[PDB]
């Protein structure tokens, strides 16, 4: 529920409705019709794919790493660049997100048009 | 390509009816899409990039571009068995058909990896048990395994160099250089090439466990994916990459923090070789020099000479690294530095890109002698045991180091007991091994 | 009743079956290959052959990075008819290890007007993934008027940089030899000549000395008018010197391979050219694995078991190099690279991921060219030397039993080890070879020594045996007066002889003399002996077998101890 910066979060989704094929590992968040929206309080990633853990399990799993922001000397040595602040990634495993030291994670999932289920998290020291 | 039954089992002649195509006998489908090789004038699509699907498949080395390419045909088991057996090998890359509503088929401009997709066959039965057309097929999935990377040891010793790796004048003491000479009495006013330990480039072996690359269950396999393995050294907020593995072996320099966008300028260690024909584990032997590390001001004690990694014979900094070290700082490895290996799995259990990491920490430990007993009869056998971790440079082999590191100190004489000692010394002990 | 013929491939399975649980040195073990694709005749025996283009696939084994024909990519090969001329290395050059004799310039004139299209005979080039064989596809013209003499082939983008990784400088390395193996039997030429070309420009088309002077020298002769198309010859030091004999940048100069032959006036549809480079040896102390290298490629000529049997049978031989033969080029040149029972060199106890693995491509039943491979470990053993008794009398006929399977270098011949008799060399009166290099672990040529009172037993010889001791009689004269003809190890004729063809245990013996001459000091060569002899009774007789490769595969000094009893 609570994360720090330069941390990785495992996102799990239990969506039996999207298990379209038993012999095919189904995916969500790939298209604009079925989007996955991960977001902080200032940064977000669009069209983030999520992958089923099993071929016929109905559970989708993926992780995103919070890269933080480069405008801080966390180590205290006197130079920036302690965290490679970069927002990128569209697959299920290569998501990179920038996050302030005081921020909040938000993951939103859509199962039908004009309907969205969301999840929340917070960022502290 | 002209006939609507292209890449389908059957005959070229085909008529369109209410039950499909007359000439269509058996089809194989990935993600409910017929697997066909790009051909004709409808395969000009290039997709998100400028490379055509057929050219992409040719570059990937996949000669199984379609059912016809594999030569898959149905053959009866016997003269009158009535059971037909056919087979083919699943390619790693396939070209998806954009639309099946036109002949010849219009193919997509980019290929996709078949892992995770469901492979389905469809045998068109002209006469069912009641004697009419019934569509029957079977379903299966193209499995894939998550990649994993492992390192031999949790910790590794700090590598050391020789006198020839420093531009400083000859001295009887290291003077802060990365030199490992004998105890002072073994040196005569100047440390030369005959009175120091050989180069201490530790050889780390990287191992991955990816069953996907084990295409041959009882044959040689090699990880041919380009730049799938990244070897790097990190010291806090700064990072340096040793090189890349998986692509063809090539000459290159050392990049710092991945700043060099062009990947062809990075050193390549070649393709990893499978340890055993039925193991699926690939091992690559790579040696790390004492200079292959992030720049720091603590290493200015040695005016380091950097061995060239490119084709030039110069000893300058730019010969080994993409950029010169900062003024007042030199590339090196300190105690506590973290050694990490990066491997990008082209297909995990979900059949996509995945990054796995393993980490090791550089460390230096004290040395302590030991003996089987305290008292010894003159002329007896002394089992001189040295226990010290940092001399284990390679875990796959047992190295040897000069006995001159130990010294004799007694009322009789003071000598290093080795070849650098006094006349007649080394003969007196008769080391076994030397 | 009609009957049909079905065309279908099969899945192969190459297996290596050792006669026991360990593949020790000097043990020929069968290699079994079951492949129905190569059984193309049900009424005869099909033997694999590199020289036969019909035999498409041959199993291969390689170690290190040998310089094959395709190290620089896909080569380009052409054929040419004409005369070499007087300013050519093929005619003037000869094998004499001389710079002028073996290194020069290559010139030619081309007269291809009578040929088809009046152009040089180009060809289609293909390379096998494991045997590395080059298959040349061209027009199968066999007319009587056809006459071709030359053949020039370029190794793609290969340069001196791609050659120096395998070819080493024999003058600078402590131990190093270069070998050239070629197979041109498919050409059917009466005489074969091969030369190495180096130039900073393109090889095709070729140039002449009278035309341009860009390169000071561009020809290095290797083979001159050999009557055998199959040959595994040791390259002379001149070739190694010429490889490093140019001051220009090695990456800026390309390499080319030249052919001159006669009696080849007919060319088949497919022709095969196989000629690689071999290299073995070590540098400086040679204890670490980084300085040990053995670059070679081995191809097995499997022979069909029966007329209609898909099982092809072969065998593999391997010799584990020791401290005695590491400095002799004959043991490296004595192996067979291309034969039904080939042999190869092993420099280190290759186990686990580095174990000797044989590779063989195959067309499976599905139709893919999947490879099948097998490997067998070739570890080392810790040599153990001991004496039959704890104590010995005068002339008790002591016998030395050495059990170490790595010294067996042939399962056919009886392996023996003589004793060195040469005062100049530092290994005088020691088992081994006259050649000896000084390293951190002692002497390279020192295999086994016998010591009384921890002093090596050697016969007085040379100019350092003039000492007379407390009396006026020299040690050699004193021994002669005493009637002791066993003045040293060499005098007794003590040599190591293997118990059997492949036992791996060596037995040697000698009689303990009553009087022996003590060596005053071992710090000089030849040894300086004491002026008086002393009776060996009561002294401890100790042997020392120098083990080049221990169980972990490195040098460990092991010996045994005994005393000369007296009553």
UniProtKB/TrEMBL annotation, chain C:
User: Where are the disulfide bridges?
Assistant: 475-517
What is the name of this protein? Uncharacterized protein
Q: Which organism is it from?
A: Nitrosopumilus maritimus (strain SCM1)
> What does UniProt list as this organism's lineage?
Archaea, Nitrososphaerota, Nitrososphaeria, Nitrosopumilales, Nitrosopumilaceae
């Amino acid at each position: 529920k609570v994360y720090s910066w330069t941390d990785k979060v495992y996102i799990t989704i239990v969506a039996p409705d999207h298990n379209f094929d038993s012999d095919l590992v189904d995916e969500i968040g790939e298209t604009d019709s079925d989007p996955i929206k991960v977001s902080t309080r200032g940064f977000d990633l669009d069209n983030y794919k999520l992958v089923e853990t099993g071929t016929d399990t109905g559970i989708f799993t993926g992780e995103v790493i919070l890269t933080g922001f480069t405008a801080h000397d966390a180590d205290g040595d006197g130079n920036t660049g302690d965290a490679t602040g970069t927002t990128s990634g569209s697959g299920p495993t290569d998501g990179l997100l920038a996050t302030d030291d005081d921020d909040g994670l938000t993951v939103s999932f859509e199962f039908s048009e004009d309907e969205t289920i969301v999840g929340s998290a917070l960022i502290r020291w | 390509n002209s006939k609507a039954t292209d890449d389908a089992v059957g005959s070229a002649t085909t008529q369109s009816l209410s039950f499909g195509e007359l000439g269509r006998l058996l089809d194989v489908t990935f993600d409910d899409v017929i697997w066909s090789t790009p051909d004709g004038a409808n395969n000009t699509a290039t997709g998100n990039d400028s490379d055509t699907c057929s050219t992409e498949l040719s570059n990937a080395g996949i000669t199984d571009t379609g059912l016809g390419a594999t030569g898959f045909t149905l053959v009866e088991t016997g003269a009158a068995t009535g059971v037909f057996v056919g087979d083919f090998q699943i390619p790693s890359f396939w070209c998806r058909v954009s639309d099946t509503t036109t002949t010849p088929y219009t193919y997509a401009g980019d290929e996709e990896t078949t892992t995770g997709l469901d492979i389905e066959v469809n045998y068109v039965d002209f006469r069912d048990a009641s004697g009419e057309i019934v569509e029957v097929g079977d379903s299966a999935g193209v499995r894939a395994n998550t990649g994993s990377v492992s390192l031999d040891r949790t910790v590794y010793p700090v590598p050391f160099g020789t006198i020839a790796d420093s531009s400083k004048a000859a001295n009887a003491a290291p003077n802060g250089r990365s030199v490992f000479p004998i105890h002072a009495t073994g040196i005569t006013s100047t440390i030369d090439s005959t009175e120091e330990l050989p180069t201490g480039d530790l050889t780390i072996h990287v191992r991955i466990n990816d069953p996907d690359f084990d295409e041959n269950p009882a044959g040689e396999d090699a990880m041919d994916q380009d730049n799938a393995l990244k070897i790097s050294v990190i010291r806090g907020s700064d990072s340096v990459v040793l090189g890349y593995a998986g692509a063809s072996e090539r000459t290159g320099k050392i990049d710092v923090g991945g700043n060099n966008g062009t990947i062809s300028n990075i050193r390549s260690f070649g393709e990893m070789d499978e340890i055993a024909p039925d193991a699926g584990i690939f091992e690559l032997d790579v040696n790390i020099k004492f200079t292959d590390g992030p720049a720091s001001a603590q290493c200015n004690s040695h005016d380091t000479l950097y061995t060239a990694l490119d084709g030039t014979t110069g000893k300058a900094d730019t010969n080994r690294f993409d950029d010169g070290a900062a003024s007042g700082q030199e590339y090196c490895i300190l105690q506590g530095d973290i050694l990490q290996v990066e491997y990008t799995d082209p297909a995990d259990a979900s059949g996509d890109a995945n990054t796995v990491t393993d980490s090791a920490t550089f460390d230096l430990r004290n040395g302590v002698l030991q003996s089987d007993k305290s008292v010894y009869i003159i002329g007896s056998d002394m089992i001189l045991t040295l226990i010290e971790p940092d001399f284990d440079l390679d875990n796959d082999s047992a190295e040897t180091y000069d006995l001159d590191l130990i010294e004799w100190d007694s009322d009789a004489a003071t000598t290093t007991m080795g070849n650098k000692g006094v006349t007649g010394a080394a003969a007196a002990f008769d080391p076994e091994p030397t | 009743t009609p009957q049909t013929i079905l065309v279908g491939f099969s899945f192969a399975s190459i297996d290596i079956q050792p006669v026991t649980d360990e593949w020790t040195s000097g043990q020929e073990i069968p290699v079994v290959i079951v492949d129905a694709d190569q059984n193309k005749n049900s009424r005869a025996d099909e033997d694999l052959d590199l020289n036969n283009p019909d035999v498409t696939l041959i199993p291969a084994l390689r170690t290190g990075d040998p310089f094959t024909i395709d190290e620089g990519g896909t080569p380009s090969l052409i054929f040419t008819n004409g005369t070499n001329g007087d300013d050519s290395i093929f005619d003037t050059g000869a094998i004499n290890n001389t710079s002028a004799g073996q290194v020069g310039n290559f010139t030619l004139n081309i007269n291809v007007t009578r040929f088809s299209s009046a152009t040089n005979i180009t060809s289609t080039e293909s390379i096998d993934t494991f045997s590395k064989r080059l298959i040349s596809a061209q027009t199968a013209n066999s007319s009587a008027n056809f006459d071709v003499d030359f053949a020039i082939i370029d190794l793609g983008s290969a340069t001196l940089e791609t050659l120096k990784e395998t070819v080493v400088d024999e003058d600078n390395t402590a131990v190093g030899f270069n070998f050239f193996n070629y197979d041109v039997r498919s050409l059917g030429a009466d005489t074969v000549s091969i030369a190495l070309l180096n130039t900073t420009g393109n090889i095709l088309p070729w140039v002449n000395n009278d035309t341009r002077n860009v390169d000071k020298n561009n020809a290095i002769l290797l083979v001159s008018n050999s009557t055998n198309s199959q040959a595994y010859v040791d390259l002379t030091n001149a070739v190694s010197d010429a490889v490093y004999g140019s001051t220009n940048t090695d990456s800026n100069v390309n390499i080319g391979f030249a052919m001159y032959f006669t009696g080849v006036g007919d060319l088949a549809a497919k022709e095969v050219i196989v000629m690689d480079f071999f290299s073995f040896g070590f540098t400086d102390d040679g204890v670490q694995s980084s300085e040990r290298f053995a670059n070679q490629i081995i191809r097995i000529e499997a022979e069909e078991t029966g007329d209609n049997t898909s099982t092809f049978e072969g065998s593999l031989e391997y010799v584990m190099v020791n401290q005695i033969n590491i400095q002799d080029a004959g043991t490296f040149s004595g192996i067979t690279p291309i034969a039904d029972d080939p042999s190869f060199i092993v420099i280190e106890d290759l186990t686990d991921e580095d174990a000797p693995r044989v590779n063989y491509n195959d067309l499976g039943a599905d139709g893919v060219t999947t490879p099948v491979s097998d490997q067998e470990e070739a570890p080392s053993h810790s040599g153990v030397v001991s004496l039959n008794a704890d104590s010995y009398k005068i002339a008790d006929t002591v016998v030395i039993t050495v059990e170490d399977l790595d010294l067996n270098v042939d399962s056919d011949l009886i392996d023996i080890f003589t004793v060195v008799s040469d005062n100049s060399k530092a290994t005088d009166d020691a088992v081994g070879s006259a050649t000896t290099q000084s390293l951190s672990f002692g002497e390279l040529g020192r295999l086994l020594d016998v010591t009384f009172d921890d002093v090596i037993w050697s016969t007085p010889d040379g100019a350092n045996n003039t000492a007379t001791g407390n009396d006026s009689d020299t040690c050699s004269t004193e021994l002669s007066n005493a009637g002791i003809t066993d003045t040293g190890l060499g005098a007794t004729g003590f040599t190591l002889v293997e118990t059997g063809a492949a036992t791996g245990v060596f037995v040697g013996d000698f009689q303990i003399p009553s009087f022996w001459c003590r060596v005053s000091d071992t710090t000089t060569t030849p040894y300086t002996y004491a002026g008086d002899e002393e009776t060996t009774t009561g002294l401890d007789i100790e042997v020392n077998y120098v083990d080049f490769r221990d169980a972990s595969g490195e040098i460990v000094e092991v010996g045994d101890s005994a005393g000369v009893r007296a009553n």
